[PDB]
């Protein structure tokens, strides 16, 4: 009687070469249709909003200016409680922890995710 779910992330840091793409996966378990739910990511230090999906649409006017036109939320299997944060033209300033979360009405769990931005050369 409790849709109360645990949120799960990588479990190990995610790697990416500078100036590249990055994908951060996050899902809820048991998985369920997270289409109506609120999903989002925070950039660890000062909880800046990296990306926010709510009421079916991406809330663009609600993300930190530093991230505009740099993210995306893969929604292929959202009905499975699965999504992924994709980021373009990576930079070191993207190195560090992130925080993903799902809000099921008055319920809301989160998972910590971390990104390693390594230097090619």
């Amino acid at each position, epitope marked *: 009687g409790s849709g109360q779910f645990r949120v799960i992330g990588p479990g190990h840091p995610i790697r990416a070469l500078v100036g590249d793409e990055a994908e951060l996966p996050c899902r809820i378990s048991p998985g369920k249709n997270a289409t109506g*739910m609120e999903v989002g990511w925070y950039r660890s230090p000062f909880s800046r909003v990296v990306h926010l999906y709510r009421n*079916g649409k991406d809330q663009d006017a609600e993300q930190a200016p530093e991230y505009r036109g740099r993210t995306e939320l893969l929604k292929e299997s959202i009905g499975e409680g699965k999504v992924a944060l994709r980021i373009q033209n990576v930079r070191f300033s993207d190195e560090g922890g992130y925080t993903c979360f799902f809000r099921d009405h*008055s319920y809301q*769990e989160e998972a910590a995710v971390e990104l390693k931005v390594e230097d090619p050369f």
Partner: antibody
Amino acid sequence: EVKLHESGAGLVKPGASVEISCKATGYTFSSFWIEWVKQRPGHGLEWIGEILPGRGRTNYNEKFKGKATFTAETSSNTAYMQLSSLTSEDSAVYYCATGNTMVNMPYWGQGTTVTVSS
Amino acid sequence: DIELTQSPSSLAVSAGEKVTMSCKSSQSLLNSGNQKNYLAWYQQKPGLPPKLLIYGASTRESGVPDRFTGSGSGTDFTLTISSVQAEDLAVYYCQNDHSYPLTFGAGTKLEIKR
């Protein structure tokens, strides 16, 4: 089994500060957003904001920004609200509500009264 | 901010009559992912807190008697009490339960004439 209870000084001097507290029992206190609602006779309900105990996340109503301030201590399953520079407008019955996976605010505390007056 | 207008501001009926309450929102209250209108109706009897009757524009909370029904969509909803009861005397508030800052209507007071 889920039930909230409110409490806090019922009489305070204008231009001071009151910290009404909300105690919750019957659940994993840290994963449900708590809502704070003001209500006064010549009016209906007012939504002040909410807070996610544990994460420590906050969302306030624009008009209450600066006026109100939330926090909580997992140690006691108590969420707090501190209204400041109290005014007669600040005279009312404040509630705190919580919810579940399908509804936000299905549970309401008994509410406590607060009157501002020197 | 979304504003909610309730009407009548109050009405009186006798036990057993059908009653219908209005609440008209200034904005849409539809979540696209749910394809559901996030509106709620609360009953408030004198002295205690508000009771939640229906959420999502038309879904009954556990326990609430079936004589209570909330329909609507778009910016216009309505609460209907099939056959009024004495204990149904109270104040009824409707609430934007989808967009911040949350907002409640002015309420519709229901008197019981006899």
